[PDB]
Write an enzyme that holds these catalytic residues in place. Structure first.
Site, PDB file in Angstrom:
ATOM      1  N   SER A  96       4.008  10.823   2.580  1.00 42.41           N
ATOM      2  CA  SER A  96       2.937   9.915   2.177  1.00 42.41           C
ATOM      3  C   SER A  96       2.099   9.612   3.400  1.00 42.41           C
ATOM      4  O   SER A  96       2.637   9.549   4.512  1.00 42.41           O
ATOM      5  CB  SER A  96       3.475   8.583   1.631  1.00 42.41           C
ATOM      6  N   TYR A 153       7.878   1.194   1.281  1.00 44.15           N
ATOM      7  CA  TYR A 153       7.502   2.541   0.886  1.00 44.15           C
ATOM      8  C   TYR A 153       7.180   3.389   2.105  1.00 44.15           C
ATOM      9  O   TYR A 153       7.712   4.494   2.272  1.00 44.15           O
ATOM     10  CB  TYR A 153       6.312   2.474  -0.043  1.00 44.15           C
TER      11      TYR A 153
END
Ligand SMILES: O=C(O)c1cccc(O)c1O
Ligand SMILES: O=C(O)c1cccc(O)c1O
Ligand SMILES: O=C(O)c1cccc(O)c1O
Ligand SMILES: [Cl-]
Ligand SMILES: [Cl-]
Ligand SMILES: [Cl-]
Lengths: 217, 220
Positions: free
Chosen positions: B132, B145
């Site tokens: 990510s 995250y």
């Protein structure tokens, strides 16, 4: 010099190693130090705390925050090293590596961020590792946990920047490297620098203290 | 073009999102695809499916051992499992923290534990892991995250080093979550980059991470 007279300083991992050296350095610099560790004469206040134990972190931190005016410095220096080839590492070593090396600081941040916001200002220094900066055979899980810790600490630094809190990291090691491995006392001096008023324009930074082994990565 | 005819490809997170788009792209490129996911609630899967929790080391061991008994070569592993749980760091629930790491790091860890011996024995292959852009720059609301994706990236790079002597290439794609440039990247477009990195056209590319987010990290 590095002067922390009168400041309230919390150091995790304070029973030995980097955390202990850092706690002693803050005591010498005039701070009111509380050291936290799994277990432990010490010239600072001691609290038993498993940083991976979220319920214990909540209970201990809530009690202590009731009696202080400011938390001037938080140092996250708890951690464990479990080595192995990625496909040989045990389930227990994987889980414990992340529970301590990332979950610990997470739990501390969950219990201290409201204090930083209400008081404004202060400093956080988190001890990562040069293994977070470069892949190291035998340390895939350790390195990955420290990379998570670094990422977490930087996002917490962004979350608290509006409150004036400075948030930095030191990454110790585990003709290059230059000189003998950097010892806990040297790491402690870098932590005190990053916590000090002399670093007031430094945030979201990570100083690698490993004799150059990462070649600047 | 990107041709995977005859190759055996494994994709995690294959029930939806990027993993599904990637499995479908490999099927269209001629590969024999097996997808892994907790649920397959979509209305169509033109590939073999294995329904399990990739975060559960015992399930992954049992399924992967069985599958490896029946294949001669694992040409490509794509790690594309992932969950997104957002929140201020001090508001995130314990469940969201735990599950974020169990899925987003533990899943790939379990797959690596069960496939590294196969990659070593066969002396080659390709791994692509979906991280990510939140692993590259701090993002408010995404502390857990991003941290899990930073751990995933680190793990994948060290595995890449551990397997480099066996000729295995190991790379990452970091999707998003006048800059940014263009519209949000759709799963099918991320899949294309994964296929490129898995392909013979990338034969001297390893330990790289291509950020596909319209430049939002400004090169970080
Ligand atoms: O005393 C020091 O170590 C020190 C370090 C960095 C900056 C300073 O001003 C110092 O006094
Ligand atoms: O067709 C493609 O997408 C492609 C991508 C990267 C490199 C190629 O050669 C391709 O053909
Ligand atoms: O993936 C994204 O988030 C994205 C956002 C804006 C522009 C883009 O090109 C993107 O890929
Ligand atoms: Cl230590
Ligand atoms: Cl085990
Ligand atoms: Cl179907």
């Amino acid at each position: 010099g590095l002067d922390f007279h009168g400041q309230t300083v919390w150091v995790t991992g304070a029973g030995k190693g980097i955390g202990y050296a850092t706690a002693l350095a803050f005591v010498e610099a005039g701070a009111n130090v509380t050291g936290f560790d799994l277990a432990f004469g010490y010239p600072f206040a001691t609290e038993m705390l498993d940083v991976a134990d979220a319920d214990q972190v909540r209970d201990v931190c809530a009690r202590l925050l009731n009696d202080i005016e400011r938390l001037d410095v938080l140092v996250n220096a708890a951690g464990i090293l479990r080595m192995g080839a990625t496909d040989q590492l045990s389930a227990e070593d994987w889980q414990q590596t992340f529970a301590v090396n990332v979950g610990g600081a997470f739990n501390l941040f969950q219990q201290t961020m409201a204090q930083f916001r209400r008081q404004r200002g202060g400093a956080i220094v988190t001890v990562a590792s040069d293994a977070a900066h470069t892949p190291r055979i035998g340390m895939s899980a350790y390195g990955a946990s420290k990379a998570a810790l670094k990422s977490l600490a930087l996002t917490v630094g962004l979350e608290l920047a509006g409150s004036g809190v400075r948030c930095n990291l030191v990454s110790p090691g585990s003709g290059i490297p230059l000189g003998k491995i950097a010892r806990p006392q040297e790491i402690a001096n870098t932590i005190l620098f990053l916590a000090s008023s002399h670093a007031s324009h430094i945030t979201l930074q990570d100083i690698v203290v490993d004799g150059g082994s990462t070649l600047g990565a």
